[PDB]
Amino acid sequence: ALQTIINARLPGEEGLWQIHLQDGKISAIDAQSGVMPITENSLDAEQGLVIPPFVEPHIHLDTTQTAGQPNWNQSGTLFEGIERWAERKALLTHDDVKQRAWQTLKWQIANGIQHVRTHVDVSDATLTALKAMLEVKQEVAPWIDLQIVAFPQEGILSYPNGEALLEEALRLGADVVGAIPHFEFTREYGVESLHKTFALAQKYDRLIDVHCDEIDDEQSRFVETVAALAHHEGMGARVTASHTTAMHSYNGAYTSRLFRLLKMSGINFVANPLVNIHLQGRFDTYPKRRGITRVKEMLESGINVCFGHDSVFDPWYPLGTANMLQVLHMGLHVCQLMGYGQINDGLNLITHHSARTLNLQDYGIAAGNSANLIILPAENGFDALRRQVPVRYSVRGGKVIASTQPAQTTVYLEQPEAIDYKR
Amino acid sequence: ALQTIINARLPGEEGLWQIHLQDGKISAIDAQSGVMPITENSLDAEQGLVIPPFVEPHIHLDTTQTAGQPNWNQSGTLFEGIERWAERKALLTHDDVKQRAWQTLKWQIANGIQHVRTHVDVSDATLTALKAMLEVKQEVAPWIDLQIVAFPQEGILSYPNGEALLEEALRLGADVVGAIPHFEFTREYGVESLHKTFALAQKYDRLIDVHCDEIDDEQSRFVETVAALAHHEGMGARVTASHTTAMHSYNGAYTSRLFRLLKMSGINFVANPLVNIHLQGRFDTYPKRRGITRVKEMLESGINVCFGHDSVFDPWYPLGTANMLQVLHMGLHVCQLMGYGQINDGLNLITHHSARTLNLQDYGIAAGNSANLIILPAENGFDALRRQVPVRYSVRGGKVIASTQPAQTTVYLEQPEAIDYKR
Ligand SMILES: [Fe+3]
Ligand SMILES: [Fe+3]
Ligand SMILES: [Mg+2]
Ligand SMILES: [Mg+2]
């Protein structure tokens, strides 16, 4: 079994480091004064970057891999997506959900993702997708720690038996309580739905992740209730507000007042760049707003924010290979986090900040933690992002669970020359 | 003791008038058909304007005189102001508050101000500033009638024990119940805080003065709740909405609907020109809104509105000499009340309208009232405002409590010539 990771670079640290492993955990981390020789039981990072695993804080595994079945979304709109999904209803079975979820999970394992939070639609009396996902969670456990959010997609108060079904999902084992206040019939139902969500989270000791203000409506302010209730209950660390795309459209004075509460509350925020740029701004003609939440300002204020993929290869988002560096690339561009340090520090948005969002208790390259880490064939976060590098090795419990042999590119000039896209 | 004020001009009246004094009160007011001779016990207004005392309806004596201690606010922003104040915390003592409050009160006495309403931060378990201000109120009584507002600066529902501290302040003697709904964590806390404020005012028979919608947010509409609750309780005369700067940003249709209620409710409004032009519009780039409430429209609709200085020589407003004619000058410009009559009638915004805001029962040059009046060396309100004249004499209880010997300016041309800035 592997005993050491050598010649590793660490974000924010100078030089090379050696990570000692024992009994599936990291026993010690020591600085090197030069390059160490390889040997039996040593995994050579080759001066590449070593980081804790990538994290997917927001994905819908119940709908993944269904694009084009039975028909393709040709307009690309949300409206048509709903119609295309409806045409596939006859194929939505226990086994179908498990097969598709596992296909995307394998791409995630290949991409160094060891922690995933999936929302599962529980606005279904049969709870078909939820029952399937609970089995998938157990099956994939050796490779990925999967959290399941009971997501009442059609609303809690605006759908028949919505609250009873949400609670049933928690009784069956869902890890997180979801909500979608802006989709409820009225603002009052929206606010009330959040009180019910928090009461359920406290009753069952579960986390909360709300699809919050995902709409280009400057009056959609459910985020202040999410933060206020979290502050009142002293549970900010266990609470997440996903999307908050309406914040992109708020006036600055209200946003400034709100930020004081967001910081005090300690809640987490998830932005989903690939999907937000695609589905937001659809009611504008020109100019067209970007529609991503205030990521740059959150970072400047010390508010925890991170990035999710949201959807993969389905009616709502036809693209994706479940790659977090690709999600990060889009977010840095749309949010204009394009200075060198902003890009280099970008890795935090898909590693540490996401681990905090999932309330993980065993995460990070530190002595005593499980030996879960990945190796990128790049010098730092900037280099990894610019070249969109694959994950050379993914290690979990001190064992290799994925590896990618890099592509090899050659140009035939006066003589053959290898191209690695470095200067 | 003084027995008469002679050769006085009165706003809106033709000619000169004689004001007879007896036992500290105004016994009678009689018109003169010409200029009266001076004599023992007669104070000669010298055809200057005589008016009841200036009033300061909104000031923060607990923070006054602290600019630059220990450091100056260099950006001039609200954010930096909060930080600069925090650096002075070690100096905030009982004696410090009394010393600074008294310094500004002396400037006010010098400026003919005999009525002052100060807000005091009661979001402090030790209520240090409040205890100091209650002593200052007693000490300054011979010269100024000071009203104290228990101002829950950090919110009523959004600060630990906020409501209990607000009530404690009333039990200690604060004259007015304050609130700040737009600063509460949520809109619901904002509305609820107003119900609590009104309940306390009725329980203790106190006035109300709310820091209301002081934010460039077109959705901040707490003013309608303040007016509706006042109308319901039949207590409009005892209620004031300070700032209402959000009203500057409302659409016209909602404002028109709202105005019917504002008039019916009978509540008072305070605009703070020097501070509002400075702190509002800070989130705009260009064009930049003025951010003062709808003063001109309130006047046209018969809604009582008046002007306050707000802050004097502190982190939030570095300037000021506590001069009401200077406050009026700024308000007339920013609110575009620049026609001759609008400027001339401007004095009402710092005298009669402010007295109504403070619910004063002994105010005005009328027989039976206490002999509290001031003399301006000007022909009318327009002239006093244009030349920013000092207060020649301030009389309280029939005795002179302040006087200013005017500056004397000379230009040396072919011969020396006195310049008084009159044409
Ligand atoms: Fe989602
Ligand atoms: Fe104030
Ligand atoms: Mg979605
Ligand atoms: Mg203020």
Swiss-Prot record, chains A, B:
**EC number(s) given by UniProt:** 3.5.4.1, 3.5.4.-
Q: How is it used?
A: Cytosine deaminase is being explored for use as a suicide gene for cancer gene therapy. The cytosine deaminase/5-fluorouracil combined therapy has been used successfully for a variety of animal tumor models and is currently under investigation for the treatment of human cancers.
Changing residue 243 to A/N does what? Less than 0.01% of wild-type enzymatic activity
Gene Ontology terms, MF aspect: cytosine deaminase activity; ferrous iron binding; identical protein binding; isoguanine deaminase activity; zinc ion binding
Nucleotide-binding found in the keyword field: no
Q: Cite the record's note on assembly.
A: Homohexamer.
What is the protein name for this chain?
Answer: Cytosine deaminase
The gene coding this protein? codA
